[PDB]
Amino acid sequence: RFLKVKNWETDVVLTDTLHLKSTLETGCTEHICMGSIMLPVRTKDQLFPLAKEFLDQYYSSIKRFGSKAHMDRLEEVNKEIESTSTYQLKDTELIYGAKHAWRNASRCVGRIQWSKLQVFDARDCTTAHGMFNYICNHVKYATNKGNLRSAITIFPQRTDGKHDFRVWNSQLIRYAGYKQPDGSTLGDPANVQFTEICIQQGWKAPRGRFDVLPLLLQANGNDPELFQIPPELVLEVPIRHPKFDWFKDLGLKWYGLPAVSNMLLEIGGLEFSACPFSGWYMGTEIGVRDYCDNSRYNILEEVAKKMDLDMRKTSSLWKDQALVEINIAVLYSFQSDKVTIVDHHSATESFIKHMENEYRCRGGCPADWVWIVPPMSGSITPVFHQEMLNYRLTPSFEYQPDPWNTHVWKG
Amino acid sequence: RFLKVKNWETDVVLTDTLHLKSTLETGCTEHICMGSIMLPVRTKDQLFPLAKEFLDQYYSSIKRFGSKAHMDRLEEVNKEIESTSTYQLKDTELIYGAKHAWRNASRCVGRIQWSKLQVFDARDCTTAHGMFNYICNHVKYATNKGNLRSAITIFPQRTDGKHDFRVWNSQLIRYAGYKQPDGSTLGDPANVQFTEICIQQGWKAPRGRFDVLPLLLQANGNDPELFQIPPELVLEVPIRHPKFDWFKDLGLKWYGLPAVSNMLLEIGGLEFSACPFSGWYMGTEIGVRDYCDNSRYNILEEVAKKMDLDMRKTSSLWKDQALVEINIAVLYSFQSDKVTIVDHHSATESFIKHMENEYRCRGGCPADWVWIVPPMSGSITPVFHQEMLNYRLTPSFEYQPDPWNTHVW
Ligand code: HEM
Ligand code: HEM
Ligand SMILES: CNCCc1cc(C#N)cc(OCc2ccc3c(C)cc(N)nc3c2)c1
Ligand SMILES: CNCCc1cc(C#N)cc(OCc2ccc3c(C)cc(N)nc3c2)c1
Ligand SMILES: C[C@H](O)[C@H](O)[C@H]1CNc2nc(N)[nH]c(=O)c2N1
Ligand SMILES: C[C@H](O)[C@H](O)[C@H]1CNc2nc(N)[nH]c(=O)c2N1
Ligand SMILES: [Zn+2]
Numbered sequence A: 001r002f003l004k005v006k007n008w009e010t011d012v013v014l015t016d017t018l019h020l021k022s023t024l025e026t027g028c029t030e031h032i033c034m035g036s037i038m039l040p041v042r043t044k045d046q047l048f049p050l051a052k053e054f055l056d057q058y059y060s061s062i063k064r065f066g067s068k069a070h071m072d073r074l075e076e077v078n079k080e081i082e083s084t085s086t087y088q089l090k091d092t093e094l095i096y097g098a099k100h101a102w103r104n105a106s107r108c109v110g111r112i113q114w115s116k117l118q119v120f121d122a123r124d125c126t127t128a129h130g131m132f133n134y135i136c137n138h139v140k141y142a143t144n145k146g147n148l149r150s151a152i153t154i155f156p157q158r159t160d161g162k163h164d165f166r167v168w169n170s171q172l173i174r175y176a177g178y179k180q181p182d183g184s185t186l187g188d189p190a191n192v193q194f195t196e197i198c199i200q201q202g203w204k205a206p207r208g209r210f211d212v213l214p215l216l217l218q219a220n221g222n223d224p225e226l227f228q229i230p231p232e233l234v235l236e237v238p239i240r241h242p243k244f245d246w247f248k249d250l251g252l253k254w255y256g257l258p259a260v261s262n263m264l265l266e267i268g269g270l271e272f273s274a275c276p277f278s279g280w281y282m283g284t285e286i287g288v289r290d291y292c293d294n295s296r297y298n299i300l301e302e303v304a305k306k307m308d309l310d311m312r313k314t315s316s317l318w319k320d321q322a323l324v325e326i327n328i329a330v331l332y333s334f335q336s337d338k339v340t341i342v343d344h345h346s347a348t349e350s351f352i353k354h355m356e357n358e359y360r361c362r363g364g365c366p367a368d369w370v371w372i373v374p375p376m377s378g379s380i381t382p383v384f385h386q387e388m389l390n391y392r393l394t395p396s397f398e399y400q401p402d403p404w405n406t407h408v409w410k411g
Numbered sequence B: 001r002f003l004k005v006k007n008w009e010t011d012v013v014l015t016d017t018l019h020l021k022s023t024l025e026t027g028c029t030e031h032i033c034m035g036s037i038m039l040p041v042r043t044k045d046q047l048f049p050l051a052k053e054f055l056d057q058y059y060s061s062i063k064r065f066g067s068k069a070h071m072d073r074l075e076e077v078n079k080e081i082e083s084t085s086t087y088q089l090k091d092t093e094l095i096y097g098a099k100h101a102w103r104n105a106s107r108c109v110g111r112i113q114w115s116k117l118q119v120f121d122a123r124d125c126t127t128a129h130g131m132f133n134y135i136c137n138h139v140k141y142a143t144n145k146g147n148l149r150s151a152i153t154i155f156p157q158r159t160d161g162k163h164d165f166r167v168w169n170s171q172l173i174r175y176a177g178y179k180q181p182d183g184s185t186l187g188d189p190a191n192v193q194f195t196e197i198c199i200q201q202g203w204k205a206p207r208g209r210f211d212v213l214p215l216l217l218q219a220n221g222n223d224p225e226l227f228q229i230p231p232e233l234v235l236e237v238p239i240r241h242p243k244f245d246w247f248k249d250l251g252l253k254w255y256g257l258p259a260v261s262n263m264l265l266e267i268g269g270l271e272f273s274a275c276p277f278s279g280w281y282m283g284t285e286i287g288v289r290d291y292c293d294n295s296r297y298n299i300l301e302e303v304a305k306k307m308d309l310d311m312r313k314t315s316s317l318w319k320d321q322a323l324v325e326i327n328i329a330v331l332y333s334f335q336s337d338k339v340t341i342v343d344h345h346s347a348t349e350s351f352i353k354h355m356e357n358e359y360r361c362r363g364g365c366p367a368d369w370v371w372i373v374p375p376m377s378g379s380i381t382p383v384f385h386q387e388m389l390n391y392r393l394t395p396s397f398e399y400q401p402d403p404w405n406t407h408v409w
Helices: A047-061 A068-084 A091-103 A128-146 A189-200 A245-250 A283-292 A300-306 A318-336 A344-362 B044-061 B068-084 B091-103 B111-116 B128-146 B189-199 B300-305 B318-336 B344-361
Strands: A003-006 A013-016 A118-121 A151-154 A177-179 A185-187 A215-218 A225-227 A236-238 A253-255 A264-267 A270-272 A396-398 B003-006 B013-016 B118-121 B151-154 B215-218 B225-227 B236-238 B253-255 B264-267 B270-272 B396-398
Touching: A013 A344, A047 A068, A047 A091, A091 A118, A091 A151, A091 A264, A091 A396, A118 A128, A128 A151, A128 A215, A128 A225, A177 A189, A185 A189, A189 A215, A236 A318, A245 A300, A283 A318, A300 A318, A318 B318, B013 B344, B044 B068, B044 B091, B091 B111, B091 B118, B091 B151, B091 B264, B091 B396, B111 B344, B118 B128, B128 B151, B128 B215, B128 B225, B236 B318, B300 B318
Parallel strands: A118 A151, B118 B151
Antiparallel strands: A003 A013, A177 A185, A215 A225, A236 A253, A264 A270, A264 A396, B003 B013, B215 B225, B236 B253, B264 B270, B264 B396
């Protein structure tokens, strides 16, 4: 069964055969599409097929399919599942798994870079302090004084689900949010809940509009612990605008390293519940979502005011106008400080090339249009007129429940 | 199986029960989502369940479900089908059918106005000249001197597929597209092929670039005929900018009346191949789409150039900045000339209200996030953080092959 996607801007057609390798499910049916829904304990019974499938993939990619090396490895993993009810990945396997999880991440516009991931194996870690140490080295290596480098750090896999490693932060670096008594929010509204947890766990909040949050780290199923990333490791960029001198006076800055830490890495049935990964920012992530979203910093209005915009009628597009300027300033700031950033035009063009290259050498590229198209200027980026097929491949990154909702407290 | 959708900006949760009454298919499966794909004759046995399904919802909507009247009409249609192999809608059913075809159009952000559709029954029409007349009356009524009103005009239903009524234009009003020897195009690149087909069938093009295309009308499956819409019926808006008075000299205008004419309307099994319908523009449909789309006017370059923006690297966001000004202007021009137009903030906010309404009174509202989200500034509109469920209800508007690929000549 061959499937076709058309680019309606260039009439280019591609043929997806890769969707047949799809194991997981979308949530869609023949009678309903859940394409815009954000979100749609493992026994040896269903593990070896998941293991076998992964090892078949791996040994295929290294062109050793059905070799004695391949067959012994299967046999070896089998006996280990038979006797220990889990199994350990070799280093080569882990690296492959991490890179393909990213490659398979259908909502990621930045996957042209997937094969250049720096994989830190932290499977020997046993304590939160050791987690803190691995994360510091990640941040330092990834940041690289502004010349950002893709990296992922992988903590030990889940076992009986009672001894999980978790990074409780949604990102390694993120600013606090404080609900004031009068209903207003100081800092980043997105992080109010997590801030409160941290504070309960004994964090001394400076209560400023741009305080870096502490790391809240859980090793081996134990209660999480608070650590402060060394300020000198957190690279930040003051936000100014190239024509607007008053923009600097808005007092804004943002951190340079986007590093997501609350997801789950699945490789051959194994689950890595703590697997922080990082790349670099597309400008709109900060400028459109992190400032202008109504449930965020919402400087939108204050930027509009200082531009002396007609803020009466929305048909003046003052909202649209301020949004462009804020994204202009975000790109301007990061470039001026030689901190790696990409604009949404560059990233989408790059992705289209990636996708075509993927269809030719892999027979497909799973892609989530709803998430790949940029949150501003959609139709003037080339992904907008690009049909995309969405399906789920393993290895993968998955969502998992917030740890504070599932964790059993030791004391 | 009582599905829930969440707004992530507001945490409002709605529960969708209406999707269980879905008949048609989406194109997706458990293994693959086709949510971004643009495009995924009836026997007696196929027809009657379709008729019954339609008549059942009709009589429920008028609170006379299971009534003598209901049962009367069911037997009545049933008998006509076994005899004539088809049937005819009562006027009331036609109006209900049409309005609900709009209500169910999951890709339409304008559906809050769905019940105020003006239906023009054109089923007595027999010729292209007749179609032209019904269409001129539609255009004039809809336009209403700039105060636009929704309308649909419905021509005879398909019979045996050889007697089809078809409006060959994609819209009633659209500018011509001529490609120059030079290489590029002038007029409107989307219409290049059709502009050729008109000339190919005898149109004499004014080869300016805002030349309103002729109508190409097909009655009862005959060869189609060219007709020129009276210019005084074609309301146009000169495009100026409220702050940049160099903008006027770009020489741009657009027509006030968006009127889609190539879709098929399906009611209780019956197929209306000619059914032009019209409302009023969302600003972005002309500015983010009919000016800057690289496969159309693509005047972005020209605009930024005499905004003298730094067009050296994409990271200056000059395209974005220009895109916004063009759209500010479109809105400004229409409002200035008192021609109806809605901005993308207003329409999306309207739709959220409409959506809530439909969950409340109907139990659901099929919606295609990929088309509902405007082509600019998506994330600062309320629909962006709105989860939506997409499914196919009937009555519906559907796509159909372009006539020139089909029509036996
Ligand atoms: C190197 C430059 C990268 C860029 C520019 C980039 C860009 C993006 C953007 C803009 C999104 C949409 C998220 C949103 O708007 O909320 C996204 C999603 C995602 N990215 Fe990438 N990314 C990069 C690197 C990476 C890396 C290194 C990984 C993993 C190792 C990764 C994995 C993912 C995943 C799993 C998602 C889906 C999130 C979800 O399902 O909620 N990305 N990316
Ligand atoms: C009155 C104001 C209206 C507004 C503002 C509006 C807005 C829109 C917009 C922005 C689209 C996106 C399509 C594109 O960008 O190319 C759309 C699609 C659509 N509209 Fe509405 N519309 C209106 C009235 C109507 C009426 C009166 C009908 C029919 C009774 C209708 C039926 C449809 C259908 C069927 C589609 C999708 C066609 C497809 O599946 O490709 N609309 N509309
Ligand atoms: C406004 N969107 C918030 C929704 C969201 C949820 C989760 C989770 N869990 C993770 C998310 O992250 C997406 C993502 C992941 C990794 C990224 C990397 C490595 C770099 C980058 N520039 N953006 C990313 C973006 C987003
Ligand atoms: C660039 N996208 C083109 C895809 C498209 C195809 C067809 C068809 N056939 C019909 C389409 O119609 C969209 C539409 C239909 C009716 C509208 C009405 C009545 C009013 C309005 N403002 N926009 C409409 C927009 C679109
Ligand atoms: C490929 C892509 O899905 C397709 O071009 C769609 C995307 N969203 C759209 N949205 C609107 N409003 N109009 C369109 O024509 C499209 N085109
Ligand atoms: C409801 C909606 O699907 C949800 O808010 C999605 C839409 N598209 C998105 N796209 C990106 N890049 N990031 C997001 O967080 C979202 N959110
Ligand atoms: Zn789907």
